[PDB]
Design a protein around this ligand. Structure first.
Ligand code: SF4
Ligand code: SF4
Ligand code: SF4
Ligand code: FES
Ligand SMILES: [Zn+2]
Lengths: 117, 240, 123, 693
């Protein structure tokens, strides 16, 4: 809401534009600059600008966290992220995930989680 | 050293070298134990002169092949590591090292295994491939990976889920392992496959025709037009 | 030694206040291939103020040093020294280090030990 | 003697019994390999190195096949090309399609040798797919991706033979053979990070470094590690303004191709807690200030304080370069002070081994001298913490030849058998008059290794007396072909500091300073600074001294300057700046030049050439880089410096203690490193992950 600047003056920003993504409040990487820091360091170029028009992509980490775990019989799940509707090669390189250890195990490419059962 | 070469030694020393030389031909001299197993009427374990004919060995010790010499597919002379003998070579072959090597097999441990016309040779070789996959120590890459690849290929050849040119590829696959490994388990693993291809290619071709008519059309690696990856698995295909 | 500095057209600061290094690339610790280690590289030491800084608009790395990405390749240390003298460049030669040779025998992994084993070799 | 053979038509002569791959390398023939490595035992499991030998009927493993006279070898036959393709085909069939996400990508020997020697396309399309492997946790330093493992066993051979960490091994059999610990155990060794270099594939990777860079985008700079006094040669890989990672480079006489985990992973301490602007204390808080403001404040404090003679005390920390120490000493002397101290305990007084001859504070046997050892006495020193790669060197010598090692001091967890003779000076007296003294008398290459931690004791002279007497007697320990007396420094700056005589005068250790200048000095305590004292801190990280300071000056770190460092050997080595310093920080000798001009005493060199001159004035060996030269004064030094002045010293009854409590945090950079803090908690002895039984 109120961000104190290096000048010592106040910048007001609506709460919804301080969120890192519409579906997530906080950063998901140590190197990632937060929205608050971005405004504090770039406010000059945000003056007389409409924040509601700026790009606000959804954070993919929450979206992938919403996908249910796939359960597999053996020791090895196979993933390729393929599009069964289109032609050609539209997924990721086909890899094999070991599910012997307890818990779920994520595809390195697409984040889909597999588990033995 | 082996226990039979050591165990015979005191008898050899007592009776003299010339006497032991008197049995069997040149360079294959003495008397070996000949365990006989498989599809003979009467399995047995016995000792005999080297250079004995195979037909005579079978008929006179084991009661002969179950069904008669007409009903013989093949014989593995020596254990699983040596290439199998077809029906028409064992009618004339002597149980030496020289004679077996000349027909491109070996004496090995003189463990005879006969396979009659009722059994599947492809299944037997597949079982040998499974054995070699289980017995690899895993030290050296050509054996540690090639035995597993050989087992996958033989599982597909057992049901016919393969293309005919892949036989040649399987042959080339054995040459990846042979001569490249630390020890001779790799060569042992390569040999039975090569015997199978050389002697029973048309058997494999028939099984492939049976699958292609029966189930469907197969791509290299055993894939078919309905087969794809779904939620962690491969569906649309048998998966040998 | 001909003073080709004065015919090249390069800035004077290059032959006045810059230092170059002449060396051979070390064998990388990550790989067993040595293909890049035979050439003699010549490249410039960095200048503190002008080397690299963060752009305030998008975050790119700016630079004021026009030599920062330049590297010359020479077939010998002597060719490189000759060229550097002909350009009036102050240089430093970093002599390369090489692996000392020793005799390696596979059989040494199995030498009989007469006393207590110092370690269990495992293979 | 050397024998002779032919390879690809060429004639090569090599020592008898050497492996064929060694002769191929000597004759300039390239042979592909995975499991072979110059520093590990021969394995012969990858089968990539096959060649034809006319006597041999089938291709042989080059790495394990001994050369013989008249041998004829061909590396270029059609059979050899076919075998290379066959082996690569078998290697790639279960390898995961991971290159886009794998950290090895672009510097991968599997990728490169696939390109050079393999098929252009695979044949493996099996519908049952590939083998997959569990991942394994072996601590916070080495991330594992074990699908990629090609079972070369380099990691196991290194962990067992070189580092002495037998927890690593291979379990199971056949296709299910797995590298690991068979149960959850850390790979617990100060040398562990080296396995990341040794792994040909991305199976073992740098965990703090993961996913941050590709090799083609990195500037590579050859420089010198300063985490200890060995002076390991390193390559710093940086991009733009930040340092990405630190890797060893080969110096067969120093670290040979290894570094320790501090040298490898404390680099992340260089991007946090950095000093970027001058600070001035005002009340209980620091305030940012200009350079002009801060230098003026130092000058005004000097005018007010008005130190006479040795009321201006200068302290040099563990990480400083020689040029900075020289400038600081020259300015301090021009102020009338002789109070140039070191940052170690009792460093207010001069060291008891003396400063007159270099051989009184150095590793007089070179580091390479340890290769020749037959008996070693360790006196108050734990090499595994003080000099990790030298500890590995001792272990290698011990493994390959008979060698007797005994130590006086704290019980040490060692990677080689050690004979404990007790923790006291009386124990040392007994030992040098007893059986191990006789061992030393009888040996061909003995050496006595004295720790820098004994120097820091009050009773130090006592020890240096005892050893000295023994050395002055035993010709095997000190004669014209071999000096077996060795002081092992722990800090990269101490040898150079003694080289320039950065040592207090006798009257200076009496005085109570009114002004203290700390140059990278973060071992200082509350007790060592008078309350009324005006404290200037000059450094690159904010750890301890900066907290004590009145004025803080930002200086460059070792990756940001081309400095001189003298290692324990007396070897003078020159580094190269990878990046520039952050923010408003400055090269440290230039800081001292400016502040001396503010103080009236403006120093006589403002250029790098002039500073190197001045260094040559102080000591001619500081400008002779990568060179070690013996002293002609070996006998004089021992009598004049160790036995002479130390007679009066009375030995204490206090036992010798461990010099460094925590290996992982020792200086300001390592104590600024999140990786070092994580590793310090992770690798603690009381944690079952670090306990085999
Ligand atoms: S060939 Fe021999 S050494 Fe190599 S993996 Fe097979 S059993 Fe082990
Ligand atoms: S180890 Fe090499 S070949 Fe394997 S995934 Fe990584 S980069 Fe690719
Ligand atoms: S983890 Fe790496 S170094 Fe260790 S055996 Fe596997 S491939 Fe070799
Ligand atoms: S390098 Fe020779 S077999 Fe591996
Ligand atoms: Zn996926």
């Amino acid at each position: 809401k109120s961000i104190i600047s290096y000048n010592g003056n106040t910048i007001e920003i609506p709460e919804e534009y301080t969120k890192q993504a519409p579906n997530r409040d906080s950063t998901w990487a140590p190197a990632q600059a937060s929205k608050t820091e971005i405004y504090k360091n770039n406010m000059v170029r945000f003056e007389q600008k409409d924040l509601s028009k700026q790009p606000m992509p959804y954070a993919g980490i929450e979206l992938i966290a919403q996908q249910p775990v796939r359960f597999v019989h053996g020791n090895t799940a196979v993933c390729d992220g393929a599009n069964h509707n289109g032609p050609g090669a539209q997924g990721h390189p086909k890899i094999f995930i070991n599910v012997d250890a307890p818990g779920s195990h994520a595809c390195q490419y697409c984040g889909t989680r597999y588990e033995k059962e | 050293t082996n226990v039979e070469t050591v165990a015979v030694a005191p008898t050899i020393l007592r009776r003299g070298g010339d006497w032991f030389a008197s049995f069997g031909r040149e360079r294959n001299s003495g008397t070996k134990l000949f365990c006989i197993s498989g599809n003979v009427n009467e399995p047995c374990t016995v000792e005999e002169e080297m250079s004995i004919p195979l037909r005579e060995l079978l008929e006179k010790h084991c009661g002969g092949i179950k069904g008669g010499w007409d009903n013989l597919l093949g014989v593995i002379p020596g254990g699983c590591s040596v290439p199998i003998l077809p029906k028409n070579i064992c009618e004339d072959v002597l149980m030496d090292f020289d004679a077996l090597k000349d027909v491109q097999s070996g004496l090995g441990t003189a463990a005879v295994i006969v396979i009659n016309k009722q059994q599947d040779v492809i299944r037997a070789i597949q079982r040998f491939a499974a054995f070699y996959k289980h017995e690899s120590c895993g030290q050296c890459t050509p054996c540690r990976e090639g035995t597993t690849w050989l087992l996958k290929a033989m599982d597909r050849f057992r049901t016919g889920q393969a293309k005919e040119r892949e036989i040649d590829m399987l042959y080339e696959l054995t040459k990846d392992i042979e001569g490249h490994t630390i020890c001779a388990l790799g060569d042992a693993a390569a040999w039975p496959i090569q015997g199978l291809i050389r002697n029973f290619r048309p058997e494999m071709e028939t099984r492939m025709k049976k699958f292609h008519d029966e189930v469907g059309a197969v791509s290299v690696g055993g894939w078919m037009k309905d087969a794809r990856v779904e939620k962690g698995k491969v569906v649309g295909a048998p998966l040998p | 030694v001909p003073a080709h500095e004065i015919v090249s057209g390069a800035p004077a600061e290059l032959s006045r206040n810059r230092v170059v290094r002449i060396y051979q690339q070390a064998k990388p610790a990550t790989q067993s291939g040595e293909y890049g280690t035979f050439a003699w590289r010549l490249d410039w030491d960095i200048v503190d103020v002008a080397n690299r800084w963060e752009n305030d608009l998008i975050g790119w790395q700016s630079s004021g040093d026009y030599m920062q990405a330049t590297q010359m390749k020479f077939t010998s240390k002597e060719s490189a020294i000759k060229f550097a003298n002909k350009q009036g460049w102050d240089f430093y030669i970093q002599e390369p280090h090489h692996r000392k040779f020793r005799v390696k025998q596979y059989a040494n992994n199995f030498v009989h030990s007469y006393g207590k084993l110092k370690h269990i070799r495992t293979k | 003697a050397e024998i002779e053979l032919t390879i690809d038509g060429h004639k090569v002569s090599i020592e008898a019994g050497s492996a064929l791959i060694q002769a191929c390398e000597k004759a300039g023939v390239t042979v592909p390999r995975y499991c072979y490595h110059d520093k590990l035992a021969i394995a012969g499991n990858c089968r990539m190195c096959l060649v034809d030998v006319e006597r041999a009927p089938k291709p042989v493993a080059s790495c394990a096949y001994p050369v013989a006279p008249g041998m004829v070898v061909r590396t270029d036959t059609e059979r050899v090309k076919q075998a290379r393709e066959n082996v690569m085909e078998m290697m790639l069939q279960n390898h995961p399609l991971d290159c886009p996400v794998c950290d090895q990508g672009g510097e991968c020997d599997l990728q490169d040798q696939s390109m050079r020697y393999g098929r252009d396309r695979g044949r493996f399309t099996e519908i049952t797919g590939k083998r997959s492997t569990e991942d394994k946790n072996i601590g916070p330093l080495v991330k594992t991706s074990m699908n990629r493992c090609i079972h070369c066993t380099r990691c196991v051979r290194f962990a067992n033979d070189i580092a002495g960490a037998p927890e690593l091994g291979s379990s199971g059999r056949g296709n299910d053979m797995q590298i690991g610990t068979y149960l959850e155990k850390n790979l617990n060794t100060e040398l562990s990070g080296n396995v990341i270099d040794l792994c040909p594939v991305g199976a073992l990777t740098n965990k703090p470094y993961a996913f941050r860079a590709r090799p083609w985008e990195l500037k590579k700079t050859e420089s010198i590690d300063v985490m200890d006094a060995v002076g390991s040669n390193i390559r710093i890989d940086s991009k733009g303004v930040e340092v990405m990672r630190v890797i060893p480079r080969v110096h067969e006489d120093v670290n040979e191709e290894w570094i320790n985990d501090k040298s490898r992973f404390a680099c992340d301490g260089l991007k946090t807690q950095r000093l970027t602007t001058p600070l001035i204390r005002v009340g209980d808080k620091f305030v940012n200030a200009t350079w002009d403001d801060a230098l003026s404040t130092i000058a005004k404090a000097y005018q007010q304080k008005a130190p006479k003679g040795d009321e201006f005390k200068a302290v040099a920390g563990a990480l400083v370069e020689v040029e900075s120490m020289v400038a600081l000493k020259d300015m301090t002397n021009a102020l009338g002070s002789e109070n140039t101290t070191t940052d170690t305990p009792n460093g207010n007084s001069a060291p008891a081994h003396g400063i007159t001859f270099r051989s009184n504070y150095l590793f007089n046997s070179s580091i390479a001298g340890i290769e020749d050892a037959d008996a070693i006495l360790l006196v108050g020193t734990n090499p595994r913490r003080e000099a990790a790669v030298m500890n590995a060197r001792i272990r290698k010598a011990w493994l390959r030849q008979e060698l007797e090692i005994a130590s006086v001091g704290p019980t040490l967890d060692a990677t080689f058998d050690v004979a404990e003779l007790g923790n006291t000076h009386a124990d040392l007296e007994k030992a040098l008059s007893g059986e191990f003294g006789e061992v030393l008398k009888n040996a061909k290459n003995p050496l006595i290794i004295v720790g820098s931690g004994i120097t820091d004791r009050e009773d130090a002279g006592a020890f240096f007396n005892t050893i000295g007497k023994f050395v002055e007697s035993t010709p095997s320990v000190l004669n014209e072909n071999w000096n077996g007396y060795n002081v092992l420094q722990r800090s990269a700056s101490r040898a150079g500091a003694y080289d320039i005589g950065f040592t207090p005068s006798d009257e200076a250790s009496k005085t109570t300073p009114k002004m203290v200048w700390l140059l990278g000095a973060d071992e200082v305590a509350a007790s060592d600074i008078p309350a009324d004292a005006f404290v200037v801190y000059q450094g690159h990280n904010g750890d301890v001294g900066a907290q004590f300071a009145d004025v803080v000056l930002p200086g460059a770190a070792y990756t940001e300057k081309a400095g001189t460092y003298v290692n324990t050997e007396g070897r003078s080595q020159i580094s190269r700046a990878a990046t520039g310093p952050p923010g408003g920080a400055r090269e440290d000798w230039k800081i001292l030049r400016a502040v001396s001009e503010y103080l009236g005493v403006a120093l006589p060199y403002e250029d790098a050439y002039e500073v190197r001159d001045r260094l040559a004035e102080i000591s001619p060996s500081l400008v002779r880089y990568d060179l070690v030269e013996p002293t002609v004064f070996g006998d004089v030094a021992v009598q004049h410096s160790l036995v002479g002045p130390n007679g009066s010293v009375t030995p204490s009854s206090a036992p010798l203690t461990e010099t460094i409590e925590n290996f992982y945090m020792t200086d300001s950079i390592s104590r600024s490193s999140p990786t070092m803090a994580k590793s310090s908690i992770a690798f603690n002895k009381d944690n079952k992950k670090n306990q085999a039984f």
